Amino acid sequence: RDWSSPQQPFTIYGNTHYVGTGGISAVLLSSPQGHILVDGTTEKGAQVVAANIRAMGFKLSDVKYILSTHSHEDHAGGISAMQKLTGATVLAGAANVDTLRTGVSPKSDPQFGSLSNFPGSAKVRAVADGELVKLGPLAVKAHATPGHTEGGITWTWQSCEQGKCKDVVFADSLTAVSADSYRFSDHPEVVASLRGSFEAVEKLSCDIAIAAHPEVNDMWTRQQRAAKEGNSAYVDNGACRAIAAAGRKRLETRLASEKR
Numbered sequence: 001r002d003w004s005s006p007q008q009p010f011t012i013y014g015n016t017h018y019v020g021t022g023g024i025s026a027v028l029l030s031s032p033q034g035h036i037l038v039d040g041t042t043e044k045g046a047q048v049v050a051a052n053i054r055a056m057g058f059k060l061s062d063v064k065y066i067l068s069t070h071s072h073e074d075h076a077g078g079i080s081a082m083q084k085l086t087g088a089t090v091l092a093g094a095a096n097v098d099t100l101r102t103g104v105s106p107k108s109d110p111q112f113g114s115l116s117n118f119p120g121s122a123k124v125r126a127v128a129d130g131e132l133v134k135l136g137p138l139a140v141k142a143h144a145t146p147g148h149t150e151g152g153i154t155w156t157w158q159s160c161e162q163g164k165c166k167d168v169v170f171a172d173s174l175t176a177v178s179a180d181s182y183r184f185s186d187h188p189e190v191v192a193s194l195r196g197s198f199e200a201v202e203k204l205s206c207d208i209a210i211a212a213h214p215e216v217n218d219m220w221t222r223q224q225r226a227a228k229e230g231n232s233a234y235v236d237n238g239a240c241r242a243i244a245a246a247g248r249k250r251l252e253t254r255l256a257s258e259k260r
């Protein structure tokens with residue numbers, strides 16, 4: 001389950017398909033009028049994501065938007081390659097646009113000093129908090145969830161099967177992690193951003209959460225459960241509350257560790 005590893009794709013609910021690697025989520029939201037891809041995985045992973053989309057019966061040229069959670073190599077490293085293969089427009093939070101274009105994270109990032117660069121993408125555009133991305137019948141909402149990065153976005157939509165619908169959340173990372181030289185306690189904007197994000201995420205309408213690191217919401221345990229129980233195994237309307245709680249715990253543990 002490495003970040004670049006092959007992973008046979010699978011449908012989670014309705015027109016929501018997992019097309020990522022063994023270790024990094026990517027989702028295709030499909031329609032007869034064209035598709036939206038969420039995240040690219042790693043640079044090597046782009047070849048996995050591309051093959052996975054085709055394996056689910058879709059054409060790369062029909063992917064019209066690529067949505068970015070955040071601009072680190074594990075989630076975004078494959079975006080540039082996928083953008084070239086698809087012709088899609090890449091959408092991201094305002095403060096991560098430059099990072100996606102250059103593939104270099106800025107000094108505001110708590111991990112700055114310890115991050116690896118990744119390939120810069122063409123056709124990157126900003127979206128605002130609350131903004132709707134529409135493609136034919138698809139409607140995906142952007143939710144600003146900064147803190148791990150300034151431009152982090154958590155993306156939400158509804159998928160349906162014969163009129164039975166579920167709220168799906170592609171949850172950005174909410175993790176307080178840094179270079180050795182960084183003190184969160186010295187950076188009130190980052191702390192406040194993280195805390196606002198925990199609050200936003202624990203309030204989302206959230207039947208099915210797909211975390212950018214899939215194990216954050218136990219994707220592989222759920223998939224194994226789904227073999228007998230069906231796709232209700234992915235459904236858990238407390239999952240966003242739980243992702244937020246774990247984010248809060250990681251930050252509180254970190255701030256305690258920093259006390260003089």
Ligand SMILES: Nc1ccc(C(=O)O)c(S)c1
Pocket residue numbers: 072074148173174175177212213
């Ligand atoms: N070192 C870390 C930890 C956590 C994440 C994350 O996405 O939560 C990343 S990219 C890097």
Ligand SMILES: [Zn+2]
Pocket residue numbers: 070072148173
């Ligand atoms: Zn990250």
Ligand SMILES: [Zn+2]
Pocket residue numbers: 072074075173212213
């Ligand atoms: Zn990550």
